[PDB]
Short mmCIF file of C-alpha atoms in Angstrom, two decimals:
data_model
loop_
_atom_site.label_atom_id
_atom_site.label_comp_id
_atom_site.label_asym_id
_atom_site.label_seq_id
_atom_site.Cartn_x
_atom_site.Cartn_y
_atom_site.Cartn_z
CA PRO A 1018 139.78 90.80 48.34
CA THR A 1019 143.88 90.69 47.00
CA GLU A 1020 146.09 92.19 49.75
CA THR A 1021 145.80 93.35 53.27
CA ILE A 1022 143.90 96.33 54.51
CA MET A 1023 146.21 99.53 56.04
CA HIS A 1024 145.21 101.85 58.71
CA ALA A 1025 148.34 103.07 60.07
CA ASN A 1026 151.26 103.60 56.70
CA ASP A 1027 151.81 106.83 58.96
CA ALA A 1028 152.36 104.90 62.26
CA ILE A 1029 156.17 106.42 63.56
CA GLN A 1030 157.99 105.59 67.36
CA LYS A 1031 157.65 109.28 68.97
CA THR A 1032 160.92 107.68 70.89
CA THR A 1033 162.69 104.23 70.64
CA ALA A 1034 164.30 102.10 72.24
CA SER A 1035 167.76 103.40 71.58
CA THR A 1036 167.50 106.88 72.86
CA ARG A 1037 165.26 106.15 76.08
CA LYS A 1038 164.53 103.34 78.90
CA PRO A 1039 162.94 100.15 76.69
CA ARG A 1040 159.09 99.29 77.53
CA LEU A 1041 158.11 95.90 78.20
CA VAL A 1042 154.71 95.11 78.30
CA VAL A 1043 152.30 92.22 79.02
CA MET A 1044 148.91 92.03 78.00
CA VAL A 1045 146.62 89.79 79.33
CA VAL A 1046 143.75 88.95 77.27
CA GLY A 1047 141.01 87.28 79.47
CA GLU A 1048 138.60 84.88 79.38
CA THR A 1049 134.91 84.65 80.71
CA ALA A 1050 135.85 86.61 83.77
CA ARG A 1051 133.12 89.18 84.11
CA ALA A 1052 133.22 92.28 86.38
CA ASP A 1053 130.32 91.54 88.04
CA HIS A 1054 131.94 89.21 90.03
CA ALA A 1055 135.36 90.92 90.54
CA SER A 1056 135.65 91.45 93.92
CA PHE A 1057 137.21 95.14 93.71
CA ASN A 1058 134.11 96.13 91.49
CA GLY A 1059 131.78 95.35 94.31
CA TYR A 1060 131.48 91.31 94.48
CA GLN A 1061 130.58 89.76 98.53
CA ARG A 1062 133.67 87.30 97.42
CA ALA A 1063 137.42 87.71 97.49
CA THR A 1064 137.17 86.64 94.34
CA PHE A 1065 141.17 89.09 93.76
CA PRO A 1066 142.29 88.58 96.69
CA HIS A 1067 145.65 89.14 95.69
CA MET A 1068 144.40 92.10 93.11
CA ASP A 1069 142.15 94.02 95.55
CA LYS A 1070 145.30 94.76 98.14
CA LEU A 1071 147.65 95.84 94.98
CA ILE A 1072 144.48 98.32 93.81
CA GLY A 1073 143.66 98.84 97.99
CA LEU A 1074 147.83 99.59 97.83
CA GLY A 1075 147.05 101.65 94.95
CA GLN A 1076 149.10 99.71 92.68
CA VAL A 1077 146.96 98.84 89.81
CA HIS A 1078 143.88 100.98 88.69
CA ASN A 1079 140.79 99.22 88.44
CA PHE A 1080 138.69 101.43 85.13
CA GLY A 1081 135.69 99.43 86.63
CA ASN A 1082 132.69 98.18 84.70
CA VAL A 1083 134.37 97.87 81.30
CA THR A 1084 132.20 96.95 77.23
CA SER A 1085 133.61 94.53 75.90
CA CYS A 1086 132.96 94.92 72.53
CA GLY A 1087 131.42 91.24 71.74
CA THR A 1088 130.03 88.21 73.67
CA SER A 1089 132.58 85.78 72.26
CA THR A 1090 136.54 84.67 71.75
CA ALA A 1091 136.44 84.38 67.74
CA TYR A 1092 134.46 88.04 67.73
CA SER A 1093 136.24 90.16 70.52
CA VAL A 1094 139.58 88.55 70.34
CA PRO A 1095 140.54 89.75 66.94
CA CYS A 1096 137.98 93.35 67.54
CA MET A 1097 140.36 93.32 70.83
CA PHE A 1098 143.76 94.55 68.70
CA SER A 1099 141.97 95.91 65.26
CA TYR A 1100 141.98 99.93 64.33
CA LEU A 1101 138.33 99.52 64.25
CA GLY A 1102 135.55 99.88 66.83
CA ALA A 1103 133.57 97.57 68.30
CA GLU A 1104 130.63 99.88 66.26
CA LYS A 1105 131.97 99.10 62.51
CA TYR A 1106 134.00 95.89 63.03
CA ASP A 1107 132.92 93.36 61.13
CA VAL A 1108 134.69 89.21 62.51
CA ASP A 1109 133.92 88.49 59.08
CA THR A 1110 136.74 90.54 57.84
CA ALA A 1111 139.06 91.05 60.79
CA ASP A 1112 141.48 89.60 58.12
CA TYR A 1113 141.35 91.29 55.67
CA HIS A 1114 142.89 94.89 58.06
CA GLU A 1115 146.84 95.00 59.78
CA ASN A 1116 145.86 95.31 62.90
CA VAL A 1117 148.34 96.74 65.99
CA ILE A 1118 150.24 93.27 66.58
CA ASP A 1119 151.18 93.88 62.87
CA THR A 1120 151.98 98.09 63.43
CA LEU A 1121 153.67 97.11 66.66
CA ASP A 1122 155.90 93.88 64.81
CA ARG A 1123 156.09 96.08 61.61
CA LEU A 1124 157.80 99.89 63.41
CA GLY A 1125 160.07 96.84 65.62
CA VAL A 1126 158.33 95.67 68.84
CA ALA A 1127 158.99 91.83 69.37
CA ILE A 1128 155.71 90.74 69.66
CA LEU A 1129 155.27 87.38 71.27
CA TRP A 1130 152.12 85.45 71.44
CA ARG A 1131 151.74 82.58 73.87
CA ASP A 1132 148.33 81.69 73.77
CA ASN A 1133 146.19 78.84 76.53
CA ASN A 1134 142.80 78.79 75.24
CA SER A 1135 142.77 78.04 71.37
CA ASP A 1136 144.41 80.55 69.22
CA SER A 1137 145.41 84.34 68.17
CA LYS A 1138 141.93 83.88 65.56
CA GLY A 1139 143.42 85.54 63.40
CA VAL A 1140 145.73 88.46 64.66
CA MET A 1141 148.77 86.46 64.91
CA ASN A 1142 148.89 84.86 61.04
CA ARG A 1143 150.98 87.82 59.28
CA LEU A 1144 153.35 87.61 61.63
CA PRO A 1145 156.22 84.80 62.00
CA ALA A 1146 154.89 81.03 62.92
CA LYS A 1147 157.71 81.07 65.44
CA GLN A 1148 156.21 84.10 67.19
CA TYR A 1149 152.99 82.49 68.21
CA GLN A 1150 153.58 79.26 70.79
CA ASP A 1151 150.81 76.57 71.65
CA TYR A 1152 150.24 76.99 75.70
CA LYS A 1153 146.90 74.52 75.64
CA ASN A 1154 149.68 71.32 75.21
CA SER A 1155 152.39 69.70 77.20
CA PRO A 1156 154.90 68.64 74.33
CA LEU A 1157 155.40 66.02 74.04
CA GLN A 1158 152.21 66.33 73.60
CA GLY A 1159 153.87 68.86 70.54
CA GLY A 1160 153.67 72.21 73.19
CA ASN A 1161 155.35 74.20 75.35
CA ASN A 1162 153.73 74.36 78.70
CA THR A 1163 155.95 72.16 81.61
CA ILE A 1164 152.36 73.13 83.81
CA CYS A 1165 150.05 70.44 82.54
CA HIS A 1166 149.90 67.46 84.82
CA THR A 1167 149.35 68.79 88.11
CA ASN A 1168 145.51 68.14 88.37
CA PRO A 1169 143.09 65.42 87.56
CA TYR A 1170 142.54 66.41 83.96
CA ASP A 1171 145.85 67.04 82.76
CA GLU A 1172 144.44 70.60 81.47
CA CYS A 1173 147.35 72.98 80.91
CA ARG A 1174 147.63 75.70 83.49
CA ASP A 1175 147.62 80.05 82.48
CA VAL A 1176 151.21 79.83 85.20
CA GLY A 1177 153.04 78.17 82.32
CA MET A 1178 153.37 80.60 79.92
CA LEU A 1179 155.37 82.61 82.53
CA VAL A 1180 158.10 80.22 82.82
CA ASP A 1181 161.36 80.98 80.70
CA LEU A 1182 159.61 83.99 79.91
CA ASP A 1183 162.92 85.60 80.27
CA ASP A 1184 164.54 83.78 76.79
CA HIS A 1185 162.47 86.57 74.83
CA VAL A 1186 163.27 89.32 77.23
CA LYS A 1187 167.59 88.58 76.71
CA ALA A 1188 167.18 88.18 72.60
CA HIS A 1189 165.48 90.75 72.76
CA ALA A 1190 166.99 93.66 75.50
CA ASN A 1191 167.49 95.83 72.45
CA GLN A 1192 163.78 97.24 71.91
CA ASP A 1193 160.64 97.88 73.00
CA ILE A 1194 158.99 93.88 73.62
CA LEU A 1195 155.03 93.10 74.12
CA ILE A 1196 154.42 89.31 75.51
CA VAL A 1197 150.85 88.93 74.98
CA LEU A 1198 148.55 86.12 77.70
CA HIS A 1199 145.64 84.01 75.55
CA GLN A 1200 144.83 82.78 79.41
CA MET A 1201 142.77 79.43 79.91
CA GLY A 1202 140.90 81.94 81.71
CA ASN A 1203 137.13 81.13 83.52
CA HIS A 1204 135.88 78.93 79.89
CA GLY A 1205 132.76 76.96 80.56
CA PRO A 1206 131.15 74.57 81.41
CA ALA A 1207 133.57 73.29 82.94
CA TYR A 1208 134.51 75.44 85.17
CA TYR A 1209 135.67 73.57 88.01
CA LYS A 1210 138.73 72.26 85.62
CA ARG A 1211 139.60 75.36 85.25
CA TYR A 1212 141.97 75.21 88.87
CA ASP A 1213 144.25 73.47 90.58
CA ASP A 1214 143.58 72.10 94.22
CA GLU A 1215 145.17 75.01 95.55
CA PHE A 1216 142.32 77.61 94.62
CA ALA A 1217 138.95 75.09 95.62
CA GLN A 1218 138.41 76.99 98.51
CA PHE A 1219 134.93 78.07 97.26
CA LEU A 1220 132.49 75.00 97.99
CA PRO A 1221 130.66 72.85 97.36
CA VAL A 1222 131.53 73.42 93.68
CA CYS A 1223 129.74 71.09 91.20
CA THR A 1224 131.97 68.76 89.19
CA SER A 1225 129.28 68.75 85.65
CA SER A 1226 128.88 70.11 82.55
CA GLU A 1227 125.22 70.66 83.19
CA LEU A 1228 125.00 74.04 84.79
CA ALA A 1229 121.18 73.52 84.51
CA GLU A 1230 121.58 70.54 86.74
CA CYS A 1231 123.13 72.19 89.32
CA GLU A 1232 122.59 74.75 91.73
CA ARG A 1233 122.97 78.08 90.43
CA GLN A 1234 125.11 78.17 93.34
CA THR A 1235 127.76 75.60 93.04
CA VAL A 1236 128.62 76.26 89.77
CA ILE A 1237 129.19 80.33 91.03
CA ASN A 1238 131.31 78.64 93.32
CA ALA A 1239 133.54 77.10 91.04
CA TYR A 1240 133.27 80.19 88.90
CA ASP A 1241 134.63 82.17 91.49
CA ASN A 1242 137.03 79.32 92.43
CA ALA A 1243 138.30 79.93 88.59
CA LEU A 1244 138.61 83.94 89.80
CA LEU A 1245 141.00 83.09 92.15
CA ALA A 1246 143.44 81.51 89.95
CA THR A 1247 143.19 83.65 87.53
CA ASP A 1248 144.29 86.84 90.95
CA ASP A 1249 147.06 84.20 91.51
CA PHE A 1250 148.34 84.09 87.78
CA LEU A 1251 148.28 87.82 87.42
CA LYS A 1252 149.86 88.07 90.64
CA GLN A 1253 152.63 86.04 89.38
CA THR A 1254 153.08 87.96 86.14
CA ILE A 1255 152.82 90.94 87.43
CA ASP A 1256 156.07 90.01 90.21
CA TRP A 1257 157.92 88.76 87.15
CA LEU A 1258 157.31 91.97 85.68
CA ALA A 1259 158.19 93.49 88.70
CA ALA A 1260 162.15 92.19 87.97
CA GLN A 1261 162.20 93.60 84.89
CA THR A 1262 164.55 96.18 86.31
CA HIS A 1263 165.91 98.00 83.14
CA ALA A 1264 163.11 98.33 81.79
CA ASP A 1265 159.68 100.35 82.16
CA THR A 1266 157.66 98.26 83.10
CA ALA A 1267 153.23 97.23 82.54
CA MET A 1268 150.30 94.75 83.08
CA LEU A 1269 147.09 95.49 81.35
CA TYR A 1270 144.25 92.79 81.55
CA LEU A 1271 141.05 92.34 79.90
CA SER A 1272 138.43 89.69 79.96
CA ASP A 1273 138.11 88.67 75.79
CA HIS A 1274 133.52 88.78 77.34
CA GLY A 1275 131.35 87.86 80.32
CA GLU A 1276 129.80 85.48 81.60
CA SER A 1277 125.80 84.19 82.44
CA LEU A 1278 125.41 82.29 85.67
CA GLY A 1279 122.47 81.42 85.56
CA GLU A 1280 120.64 84.83 85.43
CA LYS A 1281 116.98 84.69 83.69
CA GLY A 1282 118.29 80.65 82.49
CA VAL A 1283 121.03 82.54 80.38
CA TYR A 1284 124.00 80.29 80.46
CA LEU A 1285 128.21 81.01 78.90
CA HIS A 1286 128.10 83.66 76.90
CA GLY A 1287 127.69 83.83 72.43
CA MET A 1288 124.43 85.45 72.60
CA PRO A 1289 124.25 88.47 69.89
CA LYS A 1290 125.19 91.66 71.34
CA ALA A 1291 121.87 93.56 70.43
CA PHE A 1292 120.55 91.64 72.95
CA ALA A 1293 122.68 89.65 75.41
CA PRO A 1294 122.63 90.11 78.86
CA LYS A 1295 125.22 92.93 79.79
CA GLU A 1296 126.78 90.23 82.81
CA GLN A 1297 128.42 89.01 79.10
CA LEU A 1298 129.50 92.07 78.12
CA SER A 1299 130.27 93.20 81.71
CA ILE A 1300 134.12 92.85 82.01
CA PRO A 1301 137.22 93.39 84.78
CA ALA A 1302 139.62 95.92 83.66
CA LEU A 1303 143.30 95.98 85.89
CA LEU A 1304 146.25 97.65 84.16
CA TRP A 1305 149.74 97.66 86.59
CA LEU A 1306 152.66 100.27 86.01
CA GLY A 1307 156.25 99.80 87.17
CA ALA A 1308 158.20 101.25 90.02
CA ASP A 1309 159.15 105.60 88.12
CA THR A 1310 156.62 104.73 85.33
CA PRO A 1311 156.91 108.06 82.35
CA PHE A 1312 152.82 106.49 81.43
CA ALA A 1313 149.71 108.00 83.19
CA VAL A 1314 146.69 106.75 83.94
CA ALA A 1315 143.83 107.86 81.20
CA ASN A 1316 141.04 110.04 83.17
CA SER A 1317 137.47 107.54 82.87
CA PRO A 1318 134.84 108.97 79.93
CA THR A 1319 132.17 108.55 82.16
CA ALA A 1320 129.94 106.79 78.96
CA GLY A 1321 132.95 104.60 80.03
CA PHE A 1322 135.50 102.61 78.99
CA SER A 1323 135.34 100.16 76.21
CA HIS A 1324 136.67 96.94 74.08
CA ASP A 1325 137.99 100.39 71.58
CA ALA A 1326 140.19 101.20 74.47
CA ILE A 1327 142.71 99.16 73.74
CA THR A 1328 144.41 99.49 70.39
CA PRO A 1329 144.84 102.76 71.28
CA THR A 1330 146.71 102.25 74.76
CA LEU A 1331 149.05 99.53 73.15
CA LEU A 1332 149.97 102.18 71.03
CA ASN A 1333 150.70 105.03 73.15
CA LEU A 1334 152.33 102.10 75.29
CA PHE A 1335 154.99 102.40 72.79
CA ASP A 1336 154.93 105.70 71.70
CA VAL A 1337 153.66 105.08 68.70
CA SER A 1338 151.84 108.13 66.74
CA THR A 1339 149.65 107.65 63.86
CA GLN A 1340 146.26 109.41 63.12
CA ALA A 1341 145.17 105.41 62.84
CA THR A 1342 145.03 106.22 66.81
CA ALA A 1343 144.83 109.80 66.52
CA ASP A 1344 143.04 110.50 69.99
CA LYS A 1345 140.62 107.52 71.07
CA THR A 1346 139.99 106.83 74.61
CA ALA A 1347 142.46 105.28 75.62
CA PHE A 1348 143.57 103.67 79.17
CA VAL A 1349 147.14 105.29 79.23
CA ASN A 1350 148.01 109.03 78.15
CA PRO A 1351 150.09 110.03 75.44
CA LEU A 1352 153.45 111.38 76.48
CA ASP A 1353 154.38 114.15 74.27
#
């Protein structure tokens, strides 16, 4: 299949960081978190305490029940950054097409992908290897994450991706910056390993991978506790962005897919889109904008938001204009 498929040859940045205030966007790629257990979507438990207050104060925006493009990480993540909609996205040929990261990097946006999940799923392939940083392992063990030995499992935490993030920013202060943080999140089945002892408030907790043996409630507790860690992670992420004054900042959070928690005997995820439970397709979506933001929250099409809105949003966030995203539904309205 000699060479790559192009979508945004006509991609032109309407306003560059040299004529206006530079833009710094943090894209948090969530994992296995579902909107059904999001407290800001009507869940009885306070799974997102920090986010609930920011919503209750009107600091971040909740897009309610957003539909995921897939039910698995390997399927969803490449499609989240693809120009192809979920209706025409092909997971087997996703590496053949240029994505939004390719376009943004080409146009001159400093991209940095820090991963605490697995990998960019082929998204970061055409970009320099130094722009992808491993964070699922400690150094010694050839990683980068300095926050790993805070639990009996020595599992690296997502908050470790926020460490020394100022360095990459200071290296590209003259230009727009996009930082992608791939989150460990609520990866199962061992939800009890996904969080430190500080976020173990929903008790008792299923401390096993055999979710089918544990009572549904103990498994839900573990899942909800992992959400608390994510909520705190997002809180520290926003706090870091709030510290960046000389740049228009934005924090976009979306989970790659949902999760089944014993509903009709269905556990985990990965079930084919055609008949998959909607718990696997229901994801939370949050947007935070910095002080005096130039951007506006787009009106929700009722059909609802989806994963297809990510690529046009990212392009709108950097004033990139292409008929590859002429005007499809995005989270943020394009400027003039």
